[PDB]
Ligand binder design. Sequence first.
Ligand code: FAD
Length: 498
Amino acid sequence: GYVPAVVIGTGYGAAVSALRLGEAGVQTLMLEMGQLWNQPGPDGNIFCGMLNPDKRSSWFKNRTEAPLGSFLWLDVVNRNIDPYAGVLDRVNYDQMSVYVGRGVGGGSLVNGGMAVEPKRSYFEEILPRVDSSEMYDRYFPRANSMLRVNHIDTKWFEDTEWYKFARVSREQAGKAGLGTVFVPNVYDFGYMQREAAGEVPKSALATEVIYGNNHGKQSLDKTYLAAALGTGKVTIQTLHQVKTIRQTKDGGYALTVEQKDTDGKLLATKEISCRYLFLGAGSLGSTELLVRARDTGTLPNLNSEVGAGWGPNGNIMTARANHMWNPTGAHQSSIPALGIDAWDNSDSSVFAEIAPMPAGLETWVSLYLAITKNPQRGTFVYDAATDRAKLNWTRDQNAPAVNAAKALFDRINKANGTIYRYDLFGTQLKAFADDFCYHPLGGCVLGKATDDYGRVAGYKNLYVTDGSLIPGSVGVNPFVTITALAERNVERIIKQDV
Ligand SMILES: Cc1cc2nc3c(=O)[nH]c(=O)nc-3n(C[C@H](O)[C@H](O)[C@H](O)COP(=O)(O)OP(=O)(O)OC[C@H]3O[C@@H](n4cnc5c(N)ncnc54)[C@H](O)[C@@H]3O)c2cc1C
């Protein structure tokens, strides 16, 4: 049926949008293709850990996979599984694998919780049409508070075995002249201290993050979505995937929506219509819906920028082998706390997470997720034969990202007399993983496919809210930027359009 507003998805853009709609008194239905993650499973927990993956780990795959970087230690725990509506989806394109969350809360269920504001000068570079003062004065603070961002205690961090891995890389980086920074998080660091003291159930300190955290992490189901439901004006329907969007003859929008069970069986196909339609299906999901609608003729007025301008936030993974006298520890918190900030907005910029590893015994490896500034972009191109929007990105397009990451880590290796690992990503000698993405950005870029508030060009009352808006790069972990932009956009859309 009819509902005044529909929001597709339940990640960051969607959650912000639905809260503010509900507070404005607009009855809003959110459609989420994944599950509401609140049922204890066979181990009594909602989510599987990284050392006991099961079908809950994976969106319709037939075998579990090791977290990237950890195959040498964690393939031993992989098992065949039934295809199921699990929480983490590795979306394979021809030369890129994009990892996304599936469920109520989207990527907030599976991400590392790192809540970081972009550098203002870089924000101003990437989005020159946006008033940066309102962003830094009003919308970034609002996002920080609503997300429940918090900060690690420095003394605890310095003393705990669970962050030795971080301290080792800080010392090594320091020998090369390179500094680190603490990274704020939505994981409750007070809870984490209590975990280490044996006072509360472990999650971060029990090798959980990428298939969900059973405790501690303030994902969006606890923050924005809980608040949205609290307005009395928002409902969420799960295992509902929007397939098509059209403009109805009498106004508004009509959606074809498939309802499935957790085994993927089709239960019903429904028609849902609305006055206001907000897309929060992510960089991949929102872009696919709009490229499909353009190229199958159901939203024929969409422009040529729909599909364009995608980048992986410069994501590159690499690892260094420590000296024997610098073990990183068998006990590594699954939530990162430190990064190396070598980001100056130049082409050599690197912001790199000091990433924990879950093996559980000493391996001497330091792992890093680098964020770089690489101008290359891909395009989503509709394939009518398979009804899928294919990403045309080629691995050589990540050469500038690899080059930037390698120049930085070469400095660290030179200063310390260490070498890379070459065996973490596959059998072929490969020190830099250059065909994955945790931070997809773009596809429906703000001001190009849309106006400067995410109103889709060619249409009224049609909005995009999410990572698809961002022009390929933010220089930091992206969810705070997505959240703050969504706060700006929905406030303005409600004032002028609703
Ligand atoms: C392993 C990993 C680690 C990360 N670590 C961090 C980190 O620490 N900090 C950081 O800032 N970012 C991190 N990220 C990135 C961050 O999670 C994303 O940038 C963010 O979640 C994107 O928000 P979004 O609103 O664009 O979309 P998403 O959060 O991806 O949400 C989209 C939602 O829409 C649903 N959906 C999609 N298509 C449809 C459809 N057709 N119909 C219905 N529902 C649909 C999805 O199932 C999903 O729930 C990480 C991500 C991963 C995968």
